[PDB]
């Protein structure tokens, strides 16, 4: 039913009881649009991170080519499409937001403006029923208790003036807060539809829009960079199973390839040699009594000895070999040393080999080469 | 894609040592790359599936909210917003097995492999380092062949071993050249493939309901918009009307020339104050067939008071109350003694009682 406004004035318990009932559900009806606010809230949150979400993936792709390192130049075929790929994420990233601002505008603040202020307007329109109310029953007491034997008319007259006065304003706030209520049987249908019809719009355009975006045009291109993907892949297994077999024969060798002094027995010596490299260790003496060995990688170049240790970026000159002499000595019980003298005759550098055959040949290289 | 020499790890070169020290740098770079990627990725993921259950929770709420045209528009609008969840959850599932899946496998498989054989390999060179040093440390002049075989041996384990794993990892790193392109654009053609899918899929199902939907909430809109222009119009001054005219009913006591009593009455209603050992209650009265009944106002019923069907009735003092009168039934039973409020009121319920009895 509805409020009856000209049953206000009389203000009867059954009138009472009907402002009761829709002061009941007046409630019922904060309390959902409380949860629906809850509810839009976190479906405008969930949009609004899916485009922060989208921005972030974009400006990631970019950083690629920002990206920079060792091996070279990075492949201008995978910075070509994460360059489109992230456009495409930009306008992606625009869609969304604009379904962001729509349901922010159609349809979150709607509630909220319902809320705040058709809502708050009958709460506050009902506390000055309230207290007039109040008012009004106490004047209505003090009229009651007037003397009739002995009358006072001034006291008398005054008192039905605060009367009249109180159940005037209560009149007046009882009809307003009935019309309040009356209007927002409708207004609880407006507050609710709004947004629907908000989001609905916001959900339609962004759907098509997002349609148009992703076309058969863009499907073609997805299907090319797959094709480009799988080409990839299939020259990664050619060269993964001709390096599987590569290892296979370079993994299996004789026992004695990685055994020191394998051919001691029988060392098979080039004598020839004008080239040689391979690691060696290399004495260092700085006091009378104190030596240290230091393993490190040793190549011939032109008749130069060359020095690189394991870790450096380039090999040093160590010594000249040209005028020098090298020969097999003894240092601290150790095998295979060899030493070189300088071209002034002073006992040079001391260089110790794993082996017979690479002690032999070191010489017999560096002796050539002299 | 470049590539390491797999034939020179048996020498171990310083240079060999060198290339293989910027495939790592670059592994390392990728590594890096590759994990803000899945990051990103994991975002919207995580943002895809927080959409579709925001959906799913907003219909919910819906539908345990109509628990007359509000109720079919609302499970219009549920069953709209279910089948737009429906297409971010399809949506969440493709993301995860297409574009999460593949990036996630090449982290936690590919990458992890890479530095589980780089530090075996660290590992076995450090052996194969120390194998050598106890080799040239031998003594000699006095040589002992049972020690001197089993360092010889020694190094030869840790040298094959040495050979072994950065093959392995070299190997793995040359694939790795060509996975790291795959592991860029997989993912991302998947996420893609994905929108598509998506965007499809709500383009000629969602819309269609979303459509029709909008047709049928517009026209109840319409509808609900001009009935309240109307009734809010002729409401606001069916109260100007109401506070025009009930301003000389707001005097307590209303002078007899403005407000006449009528003696005719049949029916009576209005407030009074009853009497009961001793308070004054303020009570709605109303007569109703041959019964006065009364009802306190803020109480959902009222009650029996008074029979006065046979009776009198009469003013009475008490209290030096103003307007006061009572009831006697022929039964010789008396009501609460009933106070009014004005002069008129007084001698109307006197007489509207008198009226009704007999």
């Avoid at chain 1, 070509?80 to 962001?100: G, I, Q, R």
Wanted: hydrophobic share 35%; net charge negative.
């Amino acid at each position: 039913d509805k409020l009856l406004l000209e049953e206000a004035l009389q203000d009867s318990p059954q009138t009472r009881s009907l402002l009761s009932v829709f002061e009941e559900d007046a409630g019922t009806l904060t309390d959902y649009t409380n949860q629906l606010l809850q509810a839009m809230q976190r479906v405008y949150g969930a949009q609004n991170e899916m485009c922060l979400a989208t921005q972030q993936l974009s400006k990631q792709l970019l950083a690629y080519e920002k990206q920079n390192f060792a091996l070279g130049k990075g492949d201008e075929e995978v910075i070509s499409t994460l360059h489109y790929f992230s456009k495409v994420v930009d306008e992606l990233n625009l869609l969304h937001t604009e379904l962001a601002k729509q349901l922010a505008d159609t349809m979150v603040l709607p509630i909220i403006q319902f809320r705040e202020k058709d809502l708050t307007e009958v709460s506050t329109l009902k506390d000055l029923f309230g207290l007039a109310s109040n008012e009004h029953d106490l004047s209505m007491a003090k009229y009651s208790r007037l003397p009739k034997k002995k009358e006072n008319e001034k006291v008398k007259t005054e008192v039905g003036k605060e009367v009249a006065a109180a159940r005037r304003k209560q009149h007046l706030s009882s009809l307003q807060y009935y019309c309040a209520l009356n209007a927002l049987q409708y207004r609880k249908q407006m507050a609710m539809m709004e947004p629907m019809i908000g989001f609905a719009h916001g959900q339609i355009n962004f759907f098509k829009k997002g349609a148009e975006m992703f076309s058969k045009r863009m499907d073609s291109f997805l299907s090319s960079v797959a094709d480009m993907v799988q080409s990839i892949q299939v020259e990664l297994e050619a060269e993964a199973e001709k390096m599987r077999v590569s290892q296979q024969e370079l993994l299996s060798v004789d026992e004695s390839v990685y055994t020191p002094d394998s051919d001691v027995a029988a060392p098979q010596i080039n004598r020839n040699l004008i080239q040689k490299a391979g690691y060696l260790n290399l004495r260092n003496k700085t006091g009378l009594v104190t030596t240290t060995w230091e393993r490190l990688y040793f190549f011939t170049q032109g008749g130069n000895l060359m020095c690189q240790p394991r870790g450096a970026v380039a090999g040093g000159l160590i010594q000249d070999l040209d005028n020098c002499s090298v020969m097999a000595v003894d240092c601290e019980d150790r095998r295979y040393c060899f030493q070189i003298t300088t071209p002034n005759g002073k006992s040079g550098i001391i260089l110790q080999a794993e082996s017979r055959k690479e002690n032999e040949e070191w010489i017999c290289a560096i002796n050539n080469i002299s | 894609m470049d590539k390491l020499p797999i034939e020179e790890t048996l020498e171990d070169s310083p240079q060999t040592r060198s290339l293989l020290g910027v495939f790592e740098e670059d592994a390392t770079a990728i590594s890096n790359y590759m994990n803000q990627l899945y990051q990103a990725m994991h975002r919207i993921y995580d943002a895809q599936n927080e959409l579709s259950a925001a959906t799913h929770l907003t219909s919910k709420l819906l539908k345990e909210y109509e628990k007359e045209v509000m109720s079919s528009t609302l499970q219009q609008f549920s069953k709209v917003i279910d089948e737009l969840s429906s297409c971010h959850a399809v949506l969440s599932t493709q993301l995860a097995d297409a574009m999460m899946f593949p990036i996630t496998q090449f982290k936690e498989r590919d990458l992890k492999e890479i530095l589980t054989l780089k530090e075996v390999f660290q590992i076995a060179s450090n052996d194969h380092d120390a194998a050598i040093n106890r080799y040239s440390r031998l003594s000699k002049k006095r040589e002992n062949d049972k020690v001197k075989y089993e360092v010889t041996e020694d190094v030869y384990t840790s040298r094959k071993k040495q050979h072994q794993t950065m093959m392995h990892y070299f190997c793995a790193l040359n694939t790795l050249q060509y996975k790291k392109k795959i592991a860029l654009l997989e993912p991302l053609l998947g996420y893609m493939q994905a929108q598509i899918s998506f965007f499809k899929m709500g383009s000629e199902n969602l819309n269609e309901q979303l459509e029709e939907f909008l047709a049928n909430i517009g026209t109840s809109v319409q509808n609900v918009r001009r009935e309240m222009d109307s009734d809010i119009e002729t409401m606001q001054q069916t109260i100007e009307d109401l506070e025009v005219a009930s301003d000389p009913l707001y005097v307590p006591d209303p002078d007899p020339t403005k407000f006449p009593v009528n003696r005719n009455l049949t029916r009576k209603a209005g407030y009074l104050n009853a009497r009961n050992k001793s308070t004054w209650d303020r009570q709605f009265y109303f007569t109703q067939g041959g019964n006065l009944m009364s009802q306190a106002r803020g109480d959902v019923a009222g009650g029996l008071a008074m029979d006065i069907d046979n009776c009198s009735v009469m003013a009475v003092d008490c209290e030096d109350r103003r307007y006061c009168f009572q009831i006697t039934s022929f039964d010789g039973k008396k009501s609460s003694i009933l106070q009014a409020e004005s002069k008129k009121d007084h001698e109307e319920w006197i007489c509207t009682i008198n009226n009704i009895s007999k």
